[PDB]
Amino acid sequence: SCAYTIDSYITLLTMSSKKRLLVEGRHDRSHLYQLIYKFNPASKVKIDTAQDIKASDKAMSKNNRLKIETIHSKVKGKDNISFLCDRAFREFAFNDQIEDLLNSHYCDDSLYWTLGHSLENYFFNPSIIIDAFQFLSPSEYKYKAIELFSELISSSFAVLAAVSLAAKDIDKAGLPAALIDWKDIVINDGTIKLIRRDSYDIDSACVDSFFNAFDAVLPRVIASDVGICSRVVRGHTGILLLQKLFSACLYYVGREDDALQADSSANYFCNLSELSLTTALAESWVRKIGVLEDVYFPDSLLKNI
Amino acid sequence: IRTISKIELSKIHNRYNLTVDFFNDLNVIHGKNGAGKSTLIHVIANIVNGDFIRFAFLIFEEIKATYSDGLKIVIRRDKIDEQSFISVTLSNGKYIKFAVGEAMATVREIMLAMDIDKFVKENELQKVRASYFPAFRTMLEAWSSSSFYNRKASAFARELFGQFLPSINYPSPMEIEDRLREEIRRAQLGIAAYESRTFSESFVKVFSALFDNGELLKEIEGLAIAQDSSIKNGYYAEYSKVYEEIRSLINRNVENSVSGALVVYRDALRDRQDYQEKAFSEIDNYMSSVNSFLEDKEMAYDFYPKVGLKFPDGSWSPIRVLSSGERQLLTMLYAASKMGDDAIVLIDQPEISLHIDWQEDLLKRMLSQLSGRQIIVCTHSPSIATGYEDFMINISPEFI
Amino acid sequence: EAWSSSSRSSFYNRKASAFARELFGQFLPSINYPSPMEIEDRLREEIRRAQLGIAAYESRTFSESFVKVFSATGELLKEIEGLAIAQDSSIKNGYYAEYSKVYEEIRSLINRNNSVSGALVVYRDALRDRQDYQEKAFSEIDNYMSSVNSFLEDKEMAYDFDLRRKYPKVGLKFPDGSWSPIRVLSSGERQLLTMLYAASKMGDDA
Amino acid sequence: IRTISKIELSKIHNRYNLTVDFFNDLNVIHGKNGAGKSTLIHVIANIVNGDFIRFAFLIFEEIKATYSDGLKIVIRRDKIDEQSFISVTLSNGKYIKFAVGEAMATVREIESVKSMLAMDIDKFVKENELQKVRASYFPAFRTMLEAWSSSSRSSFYNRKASAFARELFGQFLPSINYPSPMEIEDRLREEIRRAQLGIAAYESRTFSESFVKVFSALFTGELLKEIEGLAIAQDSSIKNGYYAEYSKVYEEIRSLINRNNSVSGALVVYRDALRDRQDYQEKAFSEIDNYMSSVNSFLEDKEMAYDFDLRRKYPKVGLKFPDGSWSPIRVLSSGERQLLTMLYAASKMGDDAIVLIDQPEISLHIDWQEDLLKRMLSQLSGRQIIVCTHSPSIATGYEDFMINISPEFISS
Numbered sequence A: 001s002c003a004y005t006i007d008s009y010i011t012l013l014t015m016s017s018k019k020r021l022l023v024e025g026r027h028d029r030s031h032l033y034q035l036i037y038k039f040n041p042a043s044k045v046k047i048d049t050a051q052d053i054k055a056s057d058k059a060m061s062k063n064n065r066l067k068i069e070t071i072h073s074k075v076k077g078k079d080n081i082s083f084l085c086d087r088a089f090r091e092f093a094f095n096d097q098i099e100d101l102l103n104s105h106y107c108d109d110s111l112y113w114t115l116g117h118s119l120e121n122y123f124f125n126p127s128i129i130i131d132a133f134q135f136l137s138p139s140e141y142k143y144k145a146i147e148l149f150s151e152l153i154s155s156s157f158a159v160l161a162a163v164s165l166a167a168k169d170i171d172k173a174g175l176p177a178a179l180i181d182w183k184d185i186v187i188n189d190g191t192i193k194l195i196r197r198d199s200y201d202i203d204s205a206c207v208d209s210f211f212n213a214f215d216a217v218l219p220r221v222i223a224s225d226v227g228i229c230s231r232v233v234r235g236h237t238g239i240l241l242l243q244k245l246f247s248a249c250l251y252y253v254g255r256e257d258d259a260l261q262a263d264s265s266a267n268y269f270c271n272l273s274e275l276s277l278t279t280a281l282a283e284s285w286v287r288k289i290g291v292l293e294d295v296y297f298p299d300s301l302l303k304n305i
Numbered sequence B: 001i002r003t004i005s006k007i008e009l010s011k012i013h014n015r016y017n018l019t020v021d022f023f024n025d026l027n028v029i030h031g032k033n034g035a036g037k038s039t040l041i042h043v044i045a046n047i048v049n050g051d052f053i054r055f056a057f058l059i060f061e062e063i064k065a066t067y068s069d070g071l072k073i074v075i076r077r078d079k080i081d082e083q084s085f086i087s088v089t090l091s092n093g094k095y096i097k098f099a100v101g102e103a104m105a106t107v108r109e110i111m112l113a114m115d116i117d118k119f120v121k122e123n124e125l126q127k128v129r130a131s132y133f134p135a136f137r138t139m140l141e142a143w144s145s146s147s148f149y150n151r152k153a154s155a156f157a158r159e160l161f162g163q164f165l166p167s168i169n170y171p172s173p174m175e176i177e178d179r180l181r182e183e184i185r186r187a188q189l190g191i192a193a194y195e196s197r198t199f200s201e202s203f204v205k206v207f208s209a210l211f212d213n214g215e216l217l218k219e220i221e222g223l224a225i226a227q228d229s230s231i232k233n234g235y236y237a238e239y240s241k242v243y244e245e246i247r248s249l250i251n252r253n254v255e256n257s258v259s260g261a262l263v264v265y266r267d268a269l270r271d272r273q274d275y276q277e278k279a280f281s282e283i284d285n286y287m288s289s290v291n292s293f294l295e296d297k298e299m300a301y302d303f304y305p306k307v308g309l310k311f312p313d314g315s316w317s318p319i320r321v322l323s324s325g326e327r328q329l330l331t332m333l334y335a336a337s338k339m340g341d342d343a344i345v346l347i348d349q350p351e352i353s354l355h356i357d358w359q360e361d362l363l364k365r366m367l368s369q370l371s372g373r374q375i376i377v378c379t380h381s382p383s384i385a386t387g388y389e390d391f392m393i394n395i396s397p398e399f400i
Numbered sequence C: 001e002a003w004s005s006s007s008r009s010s011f012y013n014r015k016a017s018a019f020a021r022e023l024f025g026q027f028l029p030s031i032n033y034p035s036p037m038e039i040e041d042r043l044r045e046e047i048r049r050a051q052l053g054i055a056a057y058e059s060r061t062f063s064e065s066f067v068k069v070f071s072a073t074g075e076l077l078k079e080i081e082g083l084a085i086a087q088d089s090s091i092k093n094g095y096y097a098e099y100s101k102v103y104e105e106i107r108s109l110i111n112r113n114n115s116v117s118g119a120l121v122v123y124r125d126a127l128r129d130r131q132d133y134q135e136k137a138f139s140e141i142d143n144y145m146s147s148v149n150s151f152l153e154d155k156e157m158a159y160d161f162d163l164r165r166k167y168p169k170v171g172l173k174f175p176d177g178s179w180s181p182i183r184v185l186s187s188g189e190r191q192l193l194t195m196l197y198a199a200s201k202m203g204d205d206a
Numbered sequence D: 001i002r003t004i005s006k007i008e009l010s011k012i013h014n015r016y017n018l019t020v021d022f023f024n025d026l027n028v029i030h031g032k033n034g035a036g037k038s039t040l041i042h043v044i045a046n047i048v049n050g051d052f053i054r055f056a057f058l059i060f061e062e063i064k065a066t067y068s069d070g071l072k073i074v075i076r077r078d079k080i081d082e083q084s085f086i087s088v089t090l091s092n093g094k095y096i097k098f099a100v101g102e103a104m105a106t107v108r109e110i111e112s113v114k115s116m117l118a119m120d121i122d123k124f125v126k127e128n129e130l131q132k133v134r135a136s137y138f139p140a141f142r143t144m145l146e147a148w149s150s151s152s153r154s155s156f157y158n159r160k161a162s163a164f165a166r167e168l169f170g171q172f173l174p175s176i177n178y179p180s181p182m183e184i185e186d187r188l189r190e191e192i193r194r195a196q197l198g199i200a201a202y203e204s205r206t207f208s209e210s211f212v213k214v215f216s217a218l219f220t221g222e223l224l225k226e227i228e229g230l231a232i233a234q235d236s237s238i239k240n241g242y243y244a245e246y247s248k249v250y251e252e253i254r255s256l257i258n259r260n261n262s263v264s265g266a267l268v269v270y271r272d273a274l275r276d277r278q279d280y281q282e283k284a285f286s287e288i289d290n291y292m293s294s295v296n297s298f299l300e301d302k303e304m305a306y307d308f309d310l311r312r313k314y315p316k317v318g319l320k321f322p323d324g325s326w327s328p329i330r331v332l333s334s335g336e337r338q339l340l341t342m343l344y345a346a347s348k349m350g351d352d353a354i355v356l357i358d359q360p361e362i363s364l365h366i367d368w369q370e371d372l373l374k375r376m377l378s379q380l381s382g383r384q385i386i387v388c389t390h391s392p393s394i395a396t397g398y399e400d401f402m403i404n405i406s407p408e409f410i411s412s
């Protein structure tokens, strides 16, 4: 392919006089571009992606975090570049209750970590999810579905975190993405209970191990604080889980009027592209910054650049 | 509109085959050395311009071009009676087969081309043209300064790199300066016509205010200060004086008709300011796009019209004193402008003589002008294609 | 000129002067009589300069009239109607030719219902000033075209502009309405054109 | 030797001055657009070549050049009584001074044989030893320039190309001295011929000396295997393409031994003669094989090599394909030709010069840009290389040799 190596990119940092920011993926670039252009629409910061930098090492080829750490280590002390990574589950304690050992943004010579599990954890404020789902909806039974969803979202974060922890315990991170479907979800009085469906495309061994991990991790997540709980949810996992949770609540509360229409709307919502959902959440998240004190963003990173 | 969507190459140079699928807005072709990037650009430019007589000089078997609207052109190079014949077949079924030797004879003389353009004009194959930026822009610009320029430079370049090379038709900087002067004259004449309109309109407006029943002076003061301090004004720039006379006569003397006349005068001032801004909209957008790149100078106008570069000391210099990279930046920004010719912009190696801080922003500033044109670039630099990796096309030809 | 046209200006005449001194010895001076293309370019430049001065004078006149009109009959309307008819039916006002409608709107505004007479006389004075400035701007060109058209029989040298194309077209105008460039003139007409421009005020002092 | 060390500019185009400090091995010059990179390279190329008559076409005030050995050349442009004058003053006090109109007249006479001014300039630069080091100048427009040259040039004969390039890019542009691939091919053929002739002289000397040592010393299982390996390696080399019968002679000698002290000396001098001939073959072909190994490290589907046939006597130099075909060097693409010229200029076969390359990333893929400077420096020529580049893939790994250019604008 036509891309720079690590050394060529480091030399480019020496040659370029722009203010630069290095993130892992392109989606992070698009979201951060919206964030920067909100505060300064004429800002000249250029955002590069470590995904588009070739690495000679096979292991470092697809390890974005290792690329960022390697580059930051080799140019430690430069002034024109800042780095942002995803905290993932680092500095988190799973000693029967979720505990955050940092509870703030990490900083080490222009190297920063997201406050949550990843960049998408800033979208997990309930108002942003509401606004985004309301704007991007089939517009059939939106108001009642949003009202029900607003009831479910308080307790659903514990379920979502438990799902993410169950995924990371068996290292099958992408397993809940294809395993759990919105139909398995049941809409209770603010809570949900993903019944173990008898029929699944995936092998029963993975399903059984997943539910064993989920059952063994769920009381621990329940005992944790809600605010801490919303930050440990995996960024990519959470988006899909919310999409299914909204499909389930939409079909649950809209089937009485028209079961077929509710099913079509719910399936339509489940068939919405992840990129559409993330972009709508990103725009809503950008809009809520400065309006609500409960909406976070890497203020230190913006201040540094 | 109509955009290129597919190009298939079969046995070109008797050597390789290559099928490429395009986007309708931006395509960033990249590949290894000798992969046929430049040959692909030449084929696309010759097909889109309708200059099928170039294809007598290309050794191939079959070239298929598909547009966005479904129009399909298939070009074949057949061999009958130890003579090569180029066959062009449309989707309508109309076709034309012509001999290679006759095309070569018409090239050496410079009849068949008249038949070709009749076939093209009959079938509307020249609905959209193509602006071709070669990889040798700098020395060609230096050669031509020492459409007639297009014709002579095309002849010289086809003399050097073969006759299959398409017609060089990118805007030279001298053409850019001349067209900028022409746009300034048109904007001046439009402003003159607007003044004659608002002159006769405001007479009956004040005449209308005869029988109709503070901060306005400050707003008129601001408008007169802005208009007097406007570079688009060079003549009759004494609005401050008449504003002072008006406020003196006001302070000397209250009728609602006076306030209505103030409203009419304020509307006339701001409306002339709005037309003065909208007349120079394209020129200011192009120079704002250019001046976002240049560091210690600024391309600007100041009126006979003068178009040049202001330096921070206030001195003026012509466009000829610019470097190679700055001239290439000017040409590539003019091609994507709204005042540029509507075509398909084909640029071969846009990273030539450009610093990386300009290469990162070239595609962003070209697409942000909303020209709506399709841009296809062939590059070796990853900083040209950064931020637009969704449009990257990697070509790996099948060598035979 | 036939040798030149089958292959020049006051300032760029090197090949013509070289050919003339080749033919008639090197004592022969430089060929300084102008070409009709130079005359055409000079006419276009003078027309553009006249339009620019007209626009500046219109801005100044609007400013002066608005200053004059504030803090303040039938025959005035008849004179204004005649001025509007003259300016509407003038070739120089091709960029704006709607004065009689303006006059009719003014007359209807007066007619539906002193201090109005002052506005009337300053409007008439503004129209007179515009008409005089048009004649002042076009005096040299109108004098030159009056001198030229006193010789041409089946054509007249004339100018025409548009709001479609902003390029004022100058060339031969026939009474049937056809437009032709200046190169369609014969030898004698071109000689008369060059000798009248050489004696004109539009040409350089020489 | 002598390498450049400092260039001091004063009011180039009456607006900016510049001062650049160089290294003696590699100088990677980068800067903004319009910084004065190409102008700096033109100034250095004009100073080192001693073409001071170029400096009448530049608007400046004073130009000082310091070399590594301490020789300083100061060029000053003055305006006396509206007449402009160029005065060149050296560090030893020797100086010359001429008029700009005189220089323009000399250039016009060249456009039509040396002038008086050209003879004076040549006398001044010859008696002061101002032309110790040459300067190979690679322009940015070389890709179209060689296509223009190949449609109608050498380092010593580039008059037409220099005139055309000075017409296009102004008269300050230095002469286009960079080697054409035809010049590279001719130089390779001459080096192969010189190595073969030295090999023949070595054959005669080693034959006579070996006969003497054999006859004087006249009055083992491992040795035969070692001699067998040496004869097999001698027979399996391209350099022995005129005579390749060493294994047959070894088998005949072994059969002579096998059919029936002093003979041991003959065996060991045979092994020593084969070793000495093989080492002299490597030594005589050292630069050519090193250069071809540097070039063939880049080319993918072909490799440059030489071939000798006993029928003809012209040594064939060119491209070799895996299917056995041979093609000359003009069938290369543009990027491969750029690699060929830029690697020959950094080779030991090239002339002693200061290699000035403007924009080396022209028509090069990103894989070749990362290795060009490494393969130029790996030949150990000892040159001083000055490159003006915009590519970070060229300059990677050499951030100690990177020089930033920031000219100072002076207001007025």
Ligand SMILES: Nc1ncnc2c1ncn2[C@@H]1O[C@H](COP(=O)(O)OP(=O)(O)OP(=O)(O)O)[C@@H](O)[C@H]1O
Pocket (backbone or CB within 6 Å): B013, B015, B031, B032, B033, B034, B035, B036, B037, B038, B039, B040, D333, D334, D335, D363
């Ligand atoms: N007659 C010919 N004319 C042009 N190219 C030819 C011809 N015969 C063979 N080729 C090959 O066709 C290929 C196309 O060359 P071209 O210059 O278009 O390459 P590219 O992919 O644009 O890359 P680059 O700009 O690096 O050369 C090359 O590999 C060239 O060797």
Ligand SMILES: Nc1ncnc2c1ncn2[C@@H]1O[C@H](COP(=O)(O)OP(=O)(O)OP(=O)(O)O)[C@@H](O)[C@H]1O
Pocket (backbone or CB within 6 Å): B321, B322, B323, B324, B325, B326, B353, B355, D013, D032, D033, D034, D035, D036, D037, D038, D039, D040
């Ligand atoms: N004749 C001239 N008169 C005035 N200024 C000039 C003249 N020629 C060049 N300049 C200016 O002086 C500088 C010359 O820089 P130079 O030609 O070396 O640029 P460069 O290194 O090739 O630039 P780039 O990176 O844009 O290719 C530029 O700022 C240019 O505008």
